[PDB]
């Protein structure tokens, strides 16, 4: 599997030039057109083709900014940390229909919209969990995102 917190820590300590250069993409595959990307994700097994798609997604989200996604470790009590959907709902900045139209959005349409949401919401979340979600990213992980969002919003009210 792919080490998450390592990739996060690497992203937090990347040089601002590479950082700004990466942020500039507008689609995950465009990261392939950038050197700084390869140097970033090579220590984490980019060289193994199984892990590639995943990495492309992870970095893309991270590309929202050096400190848009705020990692926070899970409390020892809880079995899992704060998932993405809960984070977004907790932001108070995201509208339900953005999430709805997110999970119904096509490969690719999908990541772009997510990144927009991330920059807008600047969420605090358990990053490796997000990373896993991005590793698989299929119908049920999307649907789970919508679940967490809706259910958290209802809980909190």
């Amino acid at each position: 599997e792919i080490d998450a917190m390592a990739l996060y820590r690497a992203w937090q300590q990347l040089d601002n030039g590479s950082c700004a250069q990466i942020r500039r993409v507008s689609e995950p595959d465009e990261l392939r057109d950038i050197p700084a990307f390869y140097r970033l994700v090579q220590p984490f097994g980019w060289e193994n083709p199984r892990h590639q798609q995943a990495l492309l997604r992870m970095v893309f989200c991270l590309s929202a900014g050096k400190n848009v996604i705020r990692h926070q470790d899970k409390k020892s009590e809880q079995t899992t940390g704060i998932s993405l959907g809960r984070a977004l709902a907790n932001s108070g900045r995201i509208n339900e229909r953005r999430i709805f139209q997110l999970i119904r959005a096509d490969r690719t349409a999908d990541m772009v919209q997510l990144r927009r949401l991330l920059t807008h919401a600047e969420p605090v979340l358990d990053w490796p969990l997000m990373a896993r979600m991005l590793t698989w990213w299929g119908k049920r992980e999307r649907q789970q995102l919508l679940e967490d969002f809706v259910l958290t919003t209802n809980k909190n009210a």
Binding site: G17, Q21, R32, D33, I34, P35, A36, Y38
Partner: protein, 191 residues
């Protein structure tokens, strides 16, 4: 003093990197100079191309139009010009890294001051022409994958000719480093 100038495009397939642009260009020729005018469009990558040989269109490198020119420049006349180049200085590494021969490396560093860049222009043109008006367009650094980075500048403006054959010499040879990565090509035009 002949040449020919051609507007070509490279499919976004091969146009992903700087080196692949180079390659795409030589593969449509069984040397030259080029200037990138639109980097990625969906169709690909537009390029102005000055060459000795005739391009013929390939699978990834499509020739749009081609005409073949030679230069007749009269001294004293002012002209518009455009040149993308990378002004540098060569120094000993302050990081004191060492070469295969065993002693300290040399490093090419960009000139990051406006004045220095214009100075570099006038110097590089020297006696061939005098720059009457210039603006030094700052561009984003270009990277490539060996691996590395070049920092270009795009001069647009007005010069006056002082030595026609010299200037023509310049125009066909190219001006500055990194000739194979988009820089060097000096375009002239009547005022």
């Amino acid at each position: 003093a002949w040449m020919y100038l051609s507007k070509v495009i490279i499919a976004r397939a091969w146009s992903r990197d700087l080196y692949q642009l180079h390659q795409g260009l030589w593969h449509l020729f069984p040397d030259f100079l080029f200037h990138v005018e639109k980097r990625n469009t969906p169709e690909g990558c537009h390029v102005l191309l000055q060459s000795a040989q005739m391009p013929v269109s390939t699978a990834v490198a499509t020739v749009i139009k081609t005409k073949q020119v030679e230069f007749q420049l009269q001294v004293g006349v002012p002209l518009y010009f455009r040149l993308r180049a990378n002004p540098i200085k060569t120094i000993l590494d302050n990081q004191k890294r060492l070469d295969s021969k065993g002693n300290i490396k040399r490093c090419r560093v960009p000139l990051i001051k406006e004045a220095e860049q214009i100075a570099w222009l006038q110097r590089k043109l020297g006696n061939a022409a005098r720059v009457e008006d210039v603006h030094p367009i700052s561009e984003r650094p270009q990277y490539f994958s060996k691996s590395g980075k070049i920092q270009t500048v795009c001069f647009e403006g007005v010069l006056t000719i002082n030595d026609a054959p010299a200037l023509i010499d310049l125009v066909q040879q190219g001006i500055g480093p990194a000739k194979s990565m988009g820089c060097g090509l000096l375009s002239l035009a009547p005022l």
